[PDB]
């Protein structure tokens, strides 16, 4: 189901835990916050066909709601 | 409340799998129970130590019979409308948001609970 790339997993510390939210290919921006809706689903292993994003890749505005969970 | 766990932990339930599930794989993956209607069969004869034949006597207590493991009452939901008919109030039941509901409907659906003080498991 991940192959649709209608989800994106979050890399934090690249350790053995991973976070996932639903990405928006629309909204056309790199700083757009609304293209990202935070959920609460920490995952043990990185899924096979998953698409990975780095924590530093996030817009700085959204780091706030996330680093606390880190 | 303190008398919730004090029968399940000592009264350790039994998987109750089919008679002779161990030998042949054609049963194990079936992973259920049946009543052996045989003659030379064993458990129907109640021979010792053979995951003894199911019987009614192993019930759970009616005070908690089918209670949610958190103690509340398990009742499911399927759409926004079902919420209003919550029984009594948030004090004795817990809700399982649909296993199949969509997120674009979940986001509003989930918000409806905590504003009413409900308890949600599949958050």
């Amino acid at each position: 189901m991940l192959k649709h790339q209608k989800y994106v997993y979050v890399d934090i510390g690249d350790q053995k835990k991973f976070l996932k939210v639903r990405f928006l290919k629309s909204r056309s921006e790199n700083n757009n916050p609304e293209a990202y809706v935070i959920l609460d689903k920490i995952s043990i292993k990185l899924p096979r066909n998953a698409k990975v994003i780095k924590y530093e890749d996030l817009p700085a505005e959204v780091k706030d709601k996330l680093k606390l969970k880190l | 409340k303190p008398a919730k766990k004090n029968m399940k932990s000592p009264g350790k339930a039994i998987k109750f799998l089919r008679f002779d599930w161990d030998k042949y794989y054609r049963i194990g993956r079936q992973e259920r129970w049946r009543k052996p209607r045989g003659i030379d069969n064993a458990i129907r004869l109640e021979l010792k130590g053979y995951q003894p034949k199911v019987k009614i006597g192993y019930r759970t207590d009616k005070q908690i019979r089918g209670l949610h493991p958190s103690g509340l009452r398990p009742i499911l939901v399927k759409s926004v409308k079902d919420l209003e008919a919550f029984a009594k109030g948030k004090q004795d039941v817990i809700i399982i948001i649909s296993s199949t509901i969509g997120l674009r409907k979940r986001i509003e659906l989930i918000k409806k609970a905590e504003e009413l003080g409900l308890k949600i498991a599949n958050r």
């Binding site: 680093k67 606390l68 969970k69 | 003080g117």
Partner: protein, 123 residues
């Protein structure tokens, strides 16, 4: 907000959490109301965080007066779930106290002094 006495803006209460985050790593933190409350009586506490959303409230409502009589600073924080994860816990935590900031010396202090004026105008 029954036990809550004065309002703290979000821009201030949030600033506690990263210090709390900066506390757990290289300092001592108590999790558990029966433990955290004992810190006040043992006078071992220095900073206290209180969640203004508990239910019921009397389990935490008695802390603000008992901590005040020993003249120890404390603050109200939005969500126990946010605090619970800040405790590295998968579940919320209601009462948490600061045993030692460790490396958090330079930021715990101004929080204590810069909340007094809010309480200073709050009598």
């Amino acid at each position: 907000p029954s036990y809550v006495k004065f309002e703290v803006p979000q821009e201030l209460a949030d600033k506690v959490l990263e210090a709390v985050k900066k506390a757990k790593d290289s300092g001592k933190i108590k999790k558990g109301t029966n433990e955290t409350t004992k810190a006040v009586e043992r006078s071992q506490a220095k900073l206290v965080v209180i969640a203004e959303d508990v239910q019921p409230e009397e389990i935490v409502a008695h802390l603000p007066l008992l901590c005040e009589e020993k003249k120890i600073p404390y603050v109200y924080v939005p969500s126990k779930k946010s605090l619970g994860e800040a405790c590295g816990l998968q579940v919320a935590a209601a009462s948490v106290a600061l045993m030692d900031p460790g490396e958090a010396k330079d930021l715990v202090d101004e929080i204590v002094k810069r909340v007094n004026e809010i309480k200073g105008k709050s009598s």
